[PDB]
Design a protein around this ligand. Sequence first.
Ligand SMILES: CC1(C)Nc2nc(N)[nH]c(=O)c2N=C1C(=O)NCC(=O)N(CC(=O)NC[C@H]1O[C@@H](n2cnc3c(N)ncnc32)[C@H](O)[C@@H]1O)CP(=O)(O)O
Ligand SMILES: [Cl-]
Length: 151
Amino acid sequence: TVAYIAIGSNLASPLEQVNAALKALGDIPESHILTVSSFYRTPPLGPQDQPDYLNAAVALETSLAPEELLNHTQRIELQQGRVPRTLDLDIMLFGNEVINTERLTVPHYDMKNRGFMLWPLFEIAPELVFPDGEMLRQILHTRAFDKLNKW
Ligand SMILES: CC1(C)Nc2nc(N)[nH]c(=O)c2N=C1C(=O)NCC(=O)N(CC(=O)NC[C@H]1O[C@@H](n2cnc3c(N)ncnc32)[C@H](O)[C@@H]1O)CP(=O)(O)O
Ligand SMILES: [Cl-]
């Protein structure tokens, strides 16, 4: 199953965290990195008195159950300092699954509202269709999220 994972950090020099995160994602068992987006410099959506984010998306093939994937992404966050934002790993999509448990809401509850999630995802999955049948390309068009700048 292909999982799509969003990466975010707004440390001053976030490349170390993001590069480290990508290496660690590749070490997850029974999993393989398929494709990684470009790295983007995005203004924070929410409070504005914080540094810009580095955002990216990665497509990860995995045989793990969605919760076992979450265990591994949480481990990576912990090991890089998560306890500005050092590193957040959000599971955006997990195959065609819709999940609503105490640990997971998939698709990510807010991703359709976040250009900094959707644009990097579009780079690596331009023909993507959500579980509800909506095309990623169409969502980006409708919301008119401004395109991103590379880091
Ligand atoms: C600050 C804000 C709004 N503004 C931004 N602006 C720009 N420019 N760029 C950004 O990148 C950016 N980022 C933003 C942001 O907050 N991003 C992360 C996010 O979405 N949250 C907070 C969080 O810590 N997230 C990781 C944890 O989520 C858990 N986790 C992972 N996957 C799932 C899932 N599928 N279901 C449930 N939990 C999950 C896991 O345990 C992880 O540790 C959830 P919330 O606080 O919005 O509810
Ligand atoms: Cl470790």
